[PDB]
Design a protein around this ligand. Structure first.
Ligand SMILES: *[C@@H]1O[C@H](CO)[C@@H](O[C@@H]2O[C@H](CO)[C@@H](O[C@@H]3O[C@H](CO)[C@@H](O)[C@H](O)[C@@H]3O)[C@H](O)[C@H]2NC(C)=O)[C@H](O)[C@H]1NC(C)=O
Ligand SMILES: [Cl-]
Ligand SMILES: [Cl-]
Ligand SMILES: [Cl-]
Lengths: 11, 581
């Protein structure tokens, strides 16, 4: 998974 | 050899840092200031990431990963061999970006309108209706309305989304996109493991479900609730009936023991969004953990601006791959629900700050579930009456059952929903659910796992999964299922670290240094080691286990079993074909 990890969001 | 591999990892890591920082700030400037100028900058940074991922991914594939002696090196290269969407041919890559953009845009501006009246948005307007209204037809208005406007319009993009995301995954050596998503957990027995954990929490959910169904029977009348059938999906205080905390007033076992309305007390005592994040920051530092840098307070959008409109209000925590720059973006409303969420998101910021010294490739949680777990563990202690009374937001056995019920409505109700979402998606990705089956199969699993039925029969053209943010935004959802399980494991371990005895649900690890130490060493690993190691550092054991959650709610389970038995409830939904009249 080579893309930058997207901003983390709530469920 | 080994020398060329680490030369590659070094070069990748420093070039990735630069370009990832450039993408994030572009992603921030757009999301915090929507303009043609900021949109253009985002699109140019999109194709740069693709170019960079293509270039470095191609080289990473030239290495034979199992020939390498260093496991840290091995993990990094094996990650870079997977290009994700950047594996697609140019045209298909840009068409895929168009579709995601189109789906997210359609979701974000969808409005439900009265005839001559106002046009309501999902947040906060429709959310408020779901949370507060106790009138059947009004709840139905907002529930049906949202799925008719948001869901229906997503259906035109989804089949082509599935096609492309499946293709990108096959080009990266997976069989489908669901296969690709599950691989992030590096656990071959993952499917069975989640299945087993779901089974162990079944009797606890069924007992909660039976109890709540009866309470709704009492409020909404015998003609609208079947005591042996599924609950209508629009009645649980939440748009997606994923969490049931807003209907506390309807189900509270002892109104005989009242408690302060938290939202009232917050607005009265002068709580600001700024102040809600200060309070969450304090809770982390009390454990001896890292404070947030000054740049966080300057650059974060903790509430919506007034200088100019056009902003994305969805809650999110941002790593800028700088080592220094970490932010939260949220249009926070002053209430208990947003105070809890504030602690959750600061949990992400803490995680970013802990593993900031690692190479960017390893700047992630042990698995996607670990990341959401931190913040939720602390919020458990924040949720305790002892801590909330100290915040001047509250004021005995009957009070105890009340609290456990409130936590069950939040945590237990979410279990089947978090499990449900990706159970649906994996079957869409693997092709057992086709575009003619999308909505029927969604409601099959809503019934099977949650015991919910739709309030109104669904028609061809309805795409209700598309009314849930994570679907058109293509964010995997099983992370939250893992999150909710392991956060009670962490809780149990941190409480015995703090030397707490007695019922686990009473534990409040505020200002516990020993507890801070546990999480600190676990979070420092980032993605550098398989997750069972970080799981072992915190809990002593390497497994995901339902035992801790079961242990937490034991007093409530005993109470519900007793109460359901005496009222003559049938557990579950035996008459499963029932829908409203
Ligand atoms: C495999 O390669 C990795 C990466 O090159 C090596 O990890 C490195 O391990 C050392 C400890 O042996 C880490 O040093 C530690 O952190 C700081 C220095 O940044 C230092 O002040 C501490 O005292 C501590 O020793 C180093 O951070 C770490 N590097 C990275 C990038 O994470 C590993 O040693 C190699 N293993 C084998 C068996 O060859
Ligand atoms: Cl992600
Ligand atoms: Cl739905
Ligand atoms: Cl995930």
């Amino acid at each position: 998974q080579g893309l930058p990890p997207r901003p983390k969001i709530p469920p | 050899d080994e020398a060329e591999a680490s030369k590659f990892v070094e070069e990748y890591d420093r070039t990735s840092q630069v370009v990832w920082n450039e993408y994030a700030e572009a992603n921030w400037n757009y999301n915090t200031n929507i303009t043609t100028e900021t949109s253009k900058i985002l699109l140019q940074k999109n194709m740069q990431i693709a170019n960079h991922t293509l270039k470095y991914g191609t080289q990473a594939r030239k290495f034979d990963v199992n020939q390498l002696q260093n496991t840290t090196i091995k993990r990094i290269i094996k990650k870079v061999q997977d290009l994700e969407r950047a594996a697609l041919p140019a045209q298909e890559l840009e068409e895929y970006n168009k579709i995601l953009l189109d789906m997210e845009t359609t979701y974000s501006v969808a409005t439900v309108c009265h005839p001559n009246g106002s046009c309501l948005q999902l947040e906060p307007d429709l959310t408020n209706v779901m949370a507060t209204s106790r009138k059947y037809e009004d709840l139905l208005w907002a529930w049906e309305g949202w799925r008719d406007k948001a869901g229906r319009a997503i259906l035109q993009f989804y089949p082509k989304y599935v096609e492309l995301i499946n293709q990108a995954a096959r080009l990266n050596g997976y069989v489908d996109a669901g296969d690709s998503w599950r691989s992030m957990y590096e656990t071959p027995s993952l499917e069975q493991d989640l299945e087993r954990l779901f089974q162990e929490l079944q009797p606890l959910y069924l007992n909660l479900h039976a109890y709540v169904r009866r309470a709704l029977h009492r409020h909404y009348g015998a003609q609208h609730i079947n005591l042996e059938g599924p609950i209508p999906a629009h009645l649980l205080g939440n748009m997606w009936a994923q969490t049931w905390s807003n209907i506390y007033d309807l189900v509270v076992p002892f109104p005989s023991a009242p408690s302060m309305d938290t939202t009232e007390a917050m607005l009265k005592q002068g709580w600001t969004p700024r102040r809600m994040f200060k309070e969450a920051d304090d809770f982390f530092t009390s454990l001896g953990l890292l404070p947030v840098p000054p740049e966080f307070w300057n650059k974060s959008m903790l509430e919506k601006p007034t200088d100019g409109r056009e902003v994305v209000c969805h809650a999110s925590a941002w790593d800028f791959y700088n080592g220094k720059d970490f932010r939260i973006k949220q249009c926070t409303t002053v209430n208990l629900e947003d105070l809890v969420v504030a602690h959750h998101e600061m949990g992400h910021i803490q995680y970013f700050m802990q593993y900031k010294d690692l190479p960017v490739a390893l700047r992630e949680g042990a698995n996607p579930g670990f990341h959401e777990a931190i913040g939720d563990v602390l919020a458990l202690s924040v949720s305790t009456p002892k801590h909330l009374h100290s915040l001047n937001l509250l004021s005995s056995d009957e009070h105890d059952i009340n609290f456990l019920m409130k936590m069950a409505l939040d945590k237990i109700a979410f279990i089947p929903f978090s499990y449900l979402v990706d159970q649906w998606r994996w079957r869409v990705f693997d092709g057992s659910i086709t575009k003619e089956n999308y909505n029927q199969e969604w409601w099959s699993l809503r019934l099977k796992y949650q015991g919910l039925c739709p309030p109104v029969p669904r028609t061809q053209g309805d795409f209700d999964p598309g009314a849930k943010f994570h679907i058109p935004s293509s964010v995997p959802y099983i992370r939250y299922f893992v999150s909710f399980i392991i956060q009670f494991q962490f809780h149990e371990a941190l409480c015995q670290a703090a030397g707490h005895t007695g019922p686990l649900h009473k534990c409040d690890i505020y200002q516990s240094k020993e507890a801070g130490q546990r999480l600190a060493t676990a979070m420092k690993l980032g993605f550098s080691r398989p997750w069972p190691e970080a799981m072992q550092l915190i809990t002593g054991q390497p497994n995901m286990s339902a035992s801790a959650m079961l242990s937490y709610f034991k007093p409530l389970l005993d109470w519900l079993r007793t109460e359901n038995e005496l009222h003559g409830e049938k557990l579950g939904w035996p008459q499963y074909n029932w829908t409203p009249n």
